């Protein structure tokens, strides 16, 4: 696996592990879901955790979070939303500016250079922006 999927699978964890004690709780998950505009019941959070909790200790460690990411096919409908969510002004293209905002909503306060490289990396046709298709590949 890439040296690159390491830091990548890592940050993903860090989105939830807000204290960074090393394990993910209902509380943390919960706060994350509220950031995303959802409001899950106590039972749903437990229930979400239960499906991946290999060792039955009610929390989620790093490798169980790998069980999460690997397991979950209706991709397009969820992605067309993500695009919509990013494309704040919905002109059909996501700008560096609009990307900054999103990373931030997630908590990652980025170097601008990282944001441009992010754009530079998903930008297929080279116009400086990410359009729907480019987004589709950046994401899939």
């Amino acid at each position: 696996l890439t040296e690159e999927q390491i830091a990548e699978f890592k940050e993903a964890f860090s989105l939830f592990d807000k204290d960074g004690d090393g394990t993910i709780t209902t509380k943390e998950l919960g706060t994350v879901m509220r950031s995303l505009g959802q409001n899950p019941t106590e039972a749903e959070l437990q229930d979400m955790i239960n499906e991946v909790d290999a060792d039955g200790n009610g929390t989620i460690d790093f490798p169980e979070f790998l069980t999460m990411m690997a397991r979950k096919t209706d991709s397009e409908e969820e992605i067309r939303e993500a695009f919509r969510v990013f494309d704040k002004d919905g002109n059909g293209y996501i700008s560096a500016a609009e990307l900054r905002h999103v990373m931030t909503n997630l908590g990652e306060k980025l170097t601008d250079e990282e944001v441009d490289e992010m754009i530079r990396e998903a930008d297929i046709d080279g116009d400086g922006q990410v359009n729907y298709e480019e987004f589709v590949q950046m994401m899939t």
Partner: peptide
Amino acid sequence: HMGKIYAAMMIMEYYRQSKAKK
């Protein structure tokens, strides 16, 4: 740094995808 987007995506799916368990 695509890490976090992937997660929001997943978990979102997860939440509905788990809540098809109620």
